[PDB]
Amino acid sequence: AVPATLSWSPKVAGVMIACNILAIAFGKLTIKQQNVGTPMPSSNFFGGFGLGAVLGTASFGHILGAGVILGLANMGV
Amino acid sequence: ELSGQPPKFGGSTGGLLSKANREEKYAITWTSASEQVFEMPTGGAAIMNEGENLLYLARKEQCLALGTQLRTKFKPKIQDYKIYRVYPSGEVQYLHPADGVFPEKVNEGREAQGTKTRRIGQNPEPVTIKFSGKAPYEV
Amino acid sequence: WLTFYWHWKHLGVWSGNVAQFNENSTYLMGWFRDYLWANSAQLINGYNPYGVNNLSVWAWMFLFGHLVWATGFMFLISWRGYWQELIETIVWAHERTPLANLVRWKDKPVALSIVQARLVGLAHFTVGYVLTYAAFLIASTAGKFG
Amino acid sequence: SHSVKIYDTCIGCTQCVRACPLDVLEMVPWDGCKAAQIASSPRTEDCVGCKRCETACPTDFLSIRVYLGAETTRSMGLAY
Amino acid sequence: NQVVQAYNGDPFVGHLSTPISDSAFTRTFIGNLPAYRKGLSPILRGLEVGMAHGYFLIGPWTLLGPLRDSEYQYIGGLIGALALILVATAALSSYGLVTFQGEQGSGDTLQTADGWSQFAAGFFVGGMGGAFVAYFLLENLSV
Amino acid sequence: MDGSYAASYLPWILIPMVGWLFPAVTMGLLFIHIESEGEG
């Protein structure tokens, strides 16, 4: 009765980018210090985000995506 | 008689007990040059206000400890505090300083008390004073 | 020390087994094992989960003496100021409690004085010492011979 | 209350008065020492018997001696 | 919303206001107790206190005492309660004799020699009554 | 608690007084005496 997991497929991808996008939406409206320290080239493509904020929101999106994918694989779809 | 705004304190369980209203209590008053934080002898920190202050404590030792803290732990040294004994009837007895000059420095007009004209080794033997209500130092 | 020597030697004499004391009293482990451990077998069994025999009172007094001897230790080790402050707290608790403020003491409760504390510790100590040894000796001799 | 006595070996260093926490001691003029001052115990009914004055005395033996005696509420230093 | 403050606006007393000591409900409930009520004579105060303190004392010695598995069980509980009430009355009388010596301030009728005597007598009577009524309730097939 | 010695009923009544009555009476008298303010 080992928990069921999903092999890689475009659906798992779409879940990954969806989670990353909603994590970006969350981070834009929550982070107190959006741009501090190392910046990134060609700003305003990242909503005025520095390197640290970008990495933080990407990592949070990956964590959300991993949790969501594993939970959904435990149930159907 | 005794005037001064009490320091702003939140209240603690270390304060007075029934002895204050039954036997006596003690009062300490001083002039503060600025509203600043000092330490209650009974536990906790309270702010004292600019101008006159008045505090009720249960023991003379607590009042003198507060006076020592006032004299030592503040750059604008507070040397003007006064300690009184307050009786339940209403009598107020001035205790410290006695004549207005601190006992550490010698001031004229004081009277010697408890001073013996001999040295500690010259006290009488107990056997020579026994069966009388006296002690070798009492003689 | 005196009574231990007398009692062990006379136990050997009365049982006829003088050799046990003779060859076991030269080292302290023989004192610990052949005298104390061996002769407590019947005393501590005065009352058991199974029943009670005539040595039950002596076992109770043995434990009682051990207890009083232990109790003297805290008048002998812990000293006044700790208990004085503790009594201050208890006095606050009594004075601040409703329905207990109607009852007040006549003499202000204070901790025992230093000399009185030493005397009380020595008293509990001596009582425990005497009761413990008396119980052990009586129980051991009564079980062996009496 | 306790008794406090000052003997003629005092050198008038005033350490005992400074060390007293209940303001029992005082400095009075004198002539037996170079400092021309000797300790005194006028307010002896407030003494608790902490022996801080004795600890502060630097003479070969204490020029100030405290003899504990009758115990009052003040002597016990009780707050209740 | 500070709910804990100084005791009756006096910071320098050894107490401070809490929702347990200076609550309106607390004061209302503690002031209506028999020992703290208004207009009660001391003997009536003693009756009211002793009735409860003797009624509740029947509990132990009934399901726990040496006679707890026989027909002499409620009897033993009653006897123990009565003896405890008697010792309590003796202690109360001794305290009243010792505490109030000479000067009898009439500020409080309970804090008075004769007031405490009435309180002790009423406590004895109330303890007797409460213990006996509890015994009557707890018994079966009474003569 | 039951004995075969002569007048075995005596401990039935003597021990309680030595156990309760005498200690309680002595406690009360001493407590009153040591607490009686004044007159010495």
Add this chain to the structure above:
Amino acid sequence: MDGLKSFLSTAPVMIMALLTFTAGILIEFNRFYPDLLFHP
């Protein structure tokens, strides 16, 4: 260095060095000649 020599000469170092010297003497003697209850 002078400081090292002074440190080596302090009381604990001397006491422990002498104790190990004595202990080594006793242990070696007891190894090469054990069980000496008396001068036989």
Add this chain to the structure above:
Amino acid sequence: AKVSVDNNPVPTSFEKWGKPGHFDRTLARGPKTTTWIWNLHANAHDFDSQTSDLEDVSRKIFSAHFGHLAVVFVWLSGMYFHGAKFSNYEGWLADPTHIKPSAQVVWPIVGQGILNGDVGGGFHGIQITSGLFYLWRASGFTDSYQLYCTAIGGLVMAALMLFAGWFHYHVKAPKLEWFQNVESMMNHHLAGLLGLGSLGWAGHQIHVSMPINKLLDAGVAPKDIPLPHEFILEPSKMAELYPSFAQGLTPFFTLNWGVYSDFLTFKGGLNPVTGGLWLSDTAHHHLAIAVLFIIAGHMYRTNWGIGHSMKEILEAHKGPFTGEGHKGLYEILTTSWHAQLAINLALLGSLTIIVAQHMYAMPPYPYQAIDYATQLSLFTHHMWIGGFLIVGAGAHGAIFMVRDYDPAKNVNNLLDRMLRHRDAIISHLNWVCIFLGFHSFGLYIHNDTMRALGRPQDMFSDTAIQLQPIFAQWVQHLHTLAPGATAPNALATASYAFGGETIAVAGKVAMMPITLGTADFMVHHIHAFTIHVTALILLKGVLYARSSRLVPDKANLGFRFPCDGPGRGGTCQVSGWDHVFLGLFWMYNSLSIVIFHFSWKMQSDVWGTVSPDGSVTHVTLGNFAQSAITINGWLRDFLWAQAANVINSYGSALSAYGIMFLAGHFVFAFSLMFLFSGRGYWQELIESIVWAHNKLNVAPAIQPRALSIIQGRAVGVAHYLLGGIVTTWAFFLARSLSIG
């Protein structure tokens, strides 16, 4: 970068080595009395009192911590070397159920060669109870050369730690701002130390420990098992042992984690072959906690504005009842080392207590549960360590309160409110201590008197008035049903203490259900009473260190002073140090009762031998239930009965234990010289002896003095605790080595 250092602040010279007492101004002048010696050894490592600059104190603390790390590394390297050269580990590995572990060999000089008992396999040496052999077997050790290399690496690491201390103090000393980067320190120490350490250990286990232990448990001889690097070099063997290893690292990056289910399980329980935990369960465990700790990192704002701030969180959690709330605590814990020491000591001591109480119920090491001596030794050792650390927290907190507490920065904050209702706290705690002691120890004394009077039906026992721990039984029932019901993917219970089958290895019970009855109720509430009393003593020390109604200026007197005087009726033992001194004894009492309960219950209801039929015969039979309810039962069925193996140890290999047993009973008594007496008597005696030595003109220049009051109390408590703990250690080791 937030790094800031100072170059060559203190030159490296040997001159100050020749002048002891250089740190103290009062001691560097030169000794006149013997007290100067005792002060020198006492104020050495108190850097806060030596200097007023906080940066210098922090630098000294950093290098001293480097030194303690070097010492611990030397200890570990010594352990590995003595297990590699003077041990039968290679012999024990082939026959673990018939060979006793041993890693200490005794030279035959004066007859101590009798200590070299027969530990099986033809080896003669002292049996060890630390459990190092089981840890090494779990780590994948199979040859003594690997242990020798580990010892060499440990020595190298110790030398590196020493050089690190010398460099980071005498050459490049960090700045104060560097030390106060609590956010950066916490991030690096949660993610870089705990998380990375757990990840590295999980990698080691998966790639080394599991294959070796799987081959070992099957029955393969240690010499046949491939060396650990061969599994990495040739992954064919790894794929053979675990099929999913053929899939490589692809499923990890595609979140197809389930394929790794064969070597990352959630079995729970014990391995039947060895009696330890499953290494796959431990692998997924340490991997999961590694992930959790790395995620717990990246939490505090350090350099890129992306993170929380500790001060904001502290000052934001305030409520109606608490005035200013957690305000000013950040400045307290970033400017005073003593408060940090107190918090860390308390948490660490509780952590080792948790370690002791959890390592016995779920034994993680192979063949450890069946080695009763190792179980008891580990439990008691880490129990004592935890107790000592908790008392140290209680001490250094009072030190902080006396020294580093400043009323100006604490107005209506939680610390001040604590200092305001301290009388209420102490009074209610004193009442609860009295109530607990009365009712519990009165149950004990009541049972004693009922048994002595011949009325066993009036006792507090399972046959008599029950007093059953219904809540503990309910939680045991819940944890027994957890696999499948509330933890569906778990296969067995967390431990068999709650319930289940009896796991037994080599005809010896490894773990069976631990039933709680009336005796367990009484002992657990006795534990509660003792713990609350020790907490009361230490809390009174901490709260009342500044002042009290008796002495209103104790803060000015210091933290370590004997008394205020014979006045006020007597003011003995009022300092916070005296409260620590008093709490040490109560910690000893509580921990002694705890270890006694553990030992007796383990011997009477779990440990024992299982027959081929399945019947379990316990070490002391089922006597705990009907004897541990009276003090006489504790005295007769536990101390007298189980001390036979330590009093009859003379003439055999266990004789040393017997000797040490008596040794303890001596030192304890010796301590009563110092606790029961005072220093004036000894001073007068020294006066007479000084006259004697003066008559012969042999008087010493350093005038001898009797020990100070504080020193006398410290010596008494030290020798007392040493004697008692040594007695208990000898008794426990002899009993546990003599019960098979």
